[PDB]
Amino acid sequence: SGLVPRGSHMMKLSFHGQSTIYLEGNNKKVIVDPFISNNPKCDLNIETVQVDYIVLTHGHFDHFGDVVELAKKTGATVIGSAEMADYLSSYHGVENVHGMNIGGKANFDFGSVKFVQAFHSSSFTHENGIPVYLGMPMGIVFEVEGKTIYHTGDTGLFSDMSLIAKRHPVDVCFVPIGDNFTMGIDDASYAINEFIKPKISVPIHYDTFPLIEQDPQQFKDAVNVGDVQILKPGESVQF
Amino acid sequence: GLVPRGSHMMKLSFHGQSTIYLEGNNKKVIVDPFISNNPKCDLNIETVQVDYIVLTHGHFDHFGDVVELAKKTGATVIGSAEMADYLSSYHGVENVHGMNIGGKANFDFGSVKFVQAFHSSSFTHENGIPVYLGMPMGIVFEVEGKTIYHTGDTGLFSDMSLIAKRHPVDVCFVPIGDNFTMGIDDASYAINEFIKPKISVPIHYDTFPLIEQDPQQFKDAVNVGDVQILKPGESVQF
Amino acid sequence: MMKLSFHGQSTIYLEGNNKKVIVDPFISNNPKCDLNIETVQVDYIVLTHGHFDHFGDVVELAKKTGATVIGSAEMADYLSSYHGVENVHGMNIGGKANFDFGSVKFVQAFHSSSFTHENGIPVYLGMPMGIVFEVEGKTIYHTGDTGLFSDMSLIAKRHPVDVCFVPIGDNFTMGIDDASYAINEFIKPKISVPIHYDTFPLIEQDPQQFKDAVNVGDVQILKPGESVQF
Ligand SMILES: Nc1ncnc2c1ncn2[C@@H]1O[C@@H]2COP(=O)(O)O[C@H]2[C@H]1O
Ligand SMILES: Nc1ncnc2c1ncn2[C@@H]1O[C@@H]2COP(=O)(O)O[C@H]2[C@H]1O
Ligand SMILES: Nc1ncnc2c1ncn2[C@@H]1O[C@@H]2COP(=O)(O)O[C@H]2[C@H]1O
Ligand SMILES: [Cl-]
Ligand SMILES: [Zn+2]
Ligand SMILES: [Zn+2]
Ligand SMILES: [Zn+2]
Ligand SMILES: [Zn+2]
Ligand SMILES: [Zn+2]
Ligand SMILES: [Zn+2]
Structure with missing residues (x-):
């Protein structure tokens, strides 16, 4: 316990499939949208994942994922909308939640998290077929070890992406390209370029x-x- | 063995409230089918033929007869992921296609792209508890070379210009009723600006x-x- | 002088043509609120969104005063059918309604809107909203609980604003930087x-950081109880 914490390195930031990202700030571990056990392309394993914080953009099954089991196993704090925090706390018995909402910024030991707007939906559907509303869907602006990371969340194209990025100039943007439920290739590339x-x-x-x-090469092009x-899932951003 | 019907003026009609009907590649599409409980609606639940139902949002005056119409016709219901789950799991609708804002999907009639709107989206059960059905939406169709923008139920928003610049519009269906949506002044501003x-x-x-x-005030x-x-039953003239 | 007062959190009170209006009445459970549920007089209650700190004493206040509650379609349906409130007027974003007090127009906001029943299951109550009032020749923009959005400029250009009530608390809304940017830009x-x-x-x-x-x-x-000075 007398050992000094590990010193600085290239900021750690990795992708793990769907909208799952993992980062470290000041030796704390953060995961976003942990869809691990039910995503066969996800390289993570909920038995071995180490996290201090879980951040949820919205409540859909492919983002909510393993949050409850992961938070209960790790004691991680779950950061999300006010509705997301109350649902996790009162319906699921998660002990460590931090409610926020759009435009709100919070300072943690890892760095800062700021929620921003998105155009999508946010719910988790119960066995009777009734969605549980979990707030407006959101993107995330992180400030971690001098890096600004904008995870757009699940979203359509919107001109205030420019307002977010002008007010918080972006080192790394994670942007959905899958289409049908979000921007496709054309809208995502326009979001980045414009x-x-x-x-x-x-x-x-x-x-x-x-x-x-x-084909993500069509995005790159x-x-x-x-x-x-x-x-690919498992790979780290190179700064 | 008969070849399907050949090309004609694109078929696009209005049926009261926010209900529109269109044909693409000999497939029939209805938006927001508020038929049986709208006495100003010219359509009849028993006779209307549809291959697809598209829902901008969940409110009673749009959701309308979706469950009974989908059951009778076997139509595919295209809407938010929440609307697809609710229809499929709660109401037993056979054929749903869930989407979300900014998503585009290609069908045999043409394409559907959902866009943003500012309103609300729910269906209220008898007990006063809404069923959440996603964010409200508009629709951009590309059918037979025509780009149709149905704004859904919405307030005025500047990204109407982004939608229209990215998808230049042949026909825009825009609400003017006020109280629940844009009124005359905001809708005409939306169109002009x-x-x-x-x-x-x-x-x-x-x-x-x-x-x-008075829709003449909008026109003016x-x-x-x-x-x-x-009027309900009338077709757009191209 | 038009009567327009602040009462803590996002609660405001105004008078138009002798009719009394309250927004987001979080009275009994806000120890900093100077009002008392048992003695507030109102003809109208307007709700930006459903959260506990806005919804507040709406059911009790409405039942006691006979006030009409103005909100989203979902809020009017919930209050009427679930809570048995007698007098509701449902509206939605972009809609304007004319009352004897003046006009109310709901506008967009970026936040959430629900009231949580037992077991952490929210009751959805629409998209969150701001309000544009026109009361005794004054345009009042209550942004609601919101993050920053550029259509704040569209709202203000189309409805030039005498008074803006803007949240600065951060975490759940804009903080000082975003609110001052909203006002300035x-x-x-x-x-x-x-x-x-x-x-x-x-x-x-410290609201002085916002003023600066x-x-x-x-x-x-x-401070709670104080009136806007025109
Ligand atoms: N609650 C759920 N749990 C697991 N998988 C789901 C759930 N809801 C939807 N899916 C699947 O996730 C897929 C995402 O979109 P698709 O249309 O490809 O088909 C969907 C379903 O097969
Ligand atoms: N769930 C519902 N089912 C049937 N009619 C409704 C429902 N909700 C509202 N209405 C009616 O639709 C009308 C819409 O406008 P009004 O608010 O004037 O009055 C409303 C009611 O008369
Ligand atoms: N429904 C509720 N009823 C009463 N208090 C609440 C409710 N939801 C949240 N709170 C409290 O309100 C506080 C708002 O700020 P905090 O996030 O610090 O902590 C929150 C809770 O302690
Ligand atoms: Cl905008
Ligand atoms: Zn999603
Ligand atoms: Zn998703
Ligand atoms: Zn509606
Ligand atoms: Zn409507
Ligand atoms: Zn709130
Ligand atoms: Zn609040």
Whole structure:
């Protein structure tokens, strides 16, 4: 316990399938949208994953994923909408939640989390077929170890992507390309070129299901600003 | 062995509230089928033929007869992921296709792209507890070379210009009823400043006393394209 | 002088043509609220959204005063059918209605809207909203609980604003930086009042940092019970 915490390195930021990202800030571990056990393309394993924090963009099954079991096993704090925190706390018995809402910023030991708007939906559907409403869907702006990371969440194209990116210039943007349920290739590449203009773009939310199969090279070819890193599950952003 | 019917003026009609009907590649599509409980609606649940039902949002005056119409016709119901789950799991609808805002899907009639809207989306059970059915939406269709923008139930928003610049619009269906949506002034502003379609059709008025409007005031206020004030049963003229 | 007062969190009160209006009546459960449920007089209750800290004492206040509750379709249906409130008027975003007090127009917001029943299952109550009032020749924009959005400029350009009530608490809404940007860049009202801070430890802020950051019009840091000075 007398050992000094591990010193600085290249910021750790990895993609794990669908909308799942993992990052470390000040030796704390953060995961977004942990769809691990039910995504066969996800390289993570809920028995071995180490996390201090879980952040949810919205409540759909392919983002909510293993949050309850993961939080209960790790003691991780779950960060989400006010509705998401009350649902996790009062319906699922998750002990450590932090409710926020759009535009809200919070400072944690790992860095900062700010929720931003998205155009999508947010619910988890129960056995009777009734969606449970879990707030407006959101994107995330992280400030971690000097890096600004914008995870758009599941979203359609919107011009305030430019307002988010102007007010919070972006090192890394994770942007969905799968179409049907989100932007496709054309809208995502327009989002990056016209509005966000990050240093690095990573396409997300494709191939997990047949309906959202896409060739991410068509995204790369359409992006004219910064660098595109087409990450396979398990791969880290190179800064 | 007969070849399917060949090409004609694109078939596109208005049926009261926000109900529109269109044909693409000999497939029949209805939006927001509020038929049996809208006495101003010219259609009849027992006779209307549809291959697809598209829902902009869950409110009773749009959801309407979707369950009984889908059951009779075998039509595919296209809507939000929440609307697809609810219809399929709670109501037993056989054929659903879930989507979400910004998603585009290709069907045998043409394409459906859902876009954003500012409103609400639920269906209220008897006990006063809404069933959440996603964010409200508009629709961009591409059918037989025509781009149709149905704005859904919505307030005015500047990204109407983004939608229209990215998908230049042949016909825009825009609500004018006020109280629950844009009224005359906001809808005409939407058309003049943001959407700039070839043809505008005002919708979502007169169905209930609270949303009675003179659509001529909308026509008078619009300075771009053509305005066609359609009565229930009337077709857009191209 | 038009009567317009702040009462803690996002609660405002105004009078138009002798009719009394309250927004987001979080009275009994806000120890900083100067009002008392048993003695507030109102003809109208307007709700930006369903959260406990806005919904507040709406059912009790409505049942006691006979006030008409103005909100989203979903809020009017829930209050009427679930809570048995006698007098509701359902509206939705972009809609305007004319009352004897003046007009109410709901506008967009970025937040959430529900009231949580037992077991952490929310009752959906629509999209969250702001309000544009026109009352005794004054345009009042209550942004509701919201994040920053550029259509704040569209709302303000189409409805030039005398008074803007804008949240600064952060975590659940805009903080100081985003609110002052909203006022300076988008809304540019005659008078800005910060709201939705200090009620709970998480949303404690110094409203003086908001006043210092605002370069347009006049900032009035109202304490609960104080009136806007025209
Ligand atoms: N609750 C759920 N749990 C697991 N898989 C689901 C659930 N809901 C939908 N899916 C699947 O997830 C897929 C995503 O979109 P598809 O249309 O490809 O088909 C969907 C279903 O097969
Ligand atoms: N769930 C519902 N089912 C049937 N009619 C409804 C429902 N909700 C509202 N209405 C009626 O539809 C009308 C819409 O406009 P009004 O608010 O004037 O009055 C409303 C009611 O008369
Ligand atoms: N439904 C509720 N009823 C009463 N208090 C609540 C409710 N929801 C949240 N709170 C409290 O309100 C506080 C708002 O700020 P905090 O997030 O710090 O902590 C929150 C809770 O302690
Ligand atoms: Cl915008
Ligand atoms: Zn989703
Ligand atoms: Zn998703
Ligand atoms: Zn509606
Ligand atoms: Zn409607
Ligand atoms: Zn709130
Ligand atoms: Zn609040």
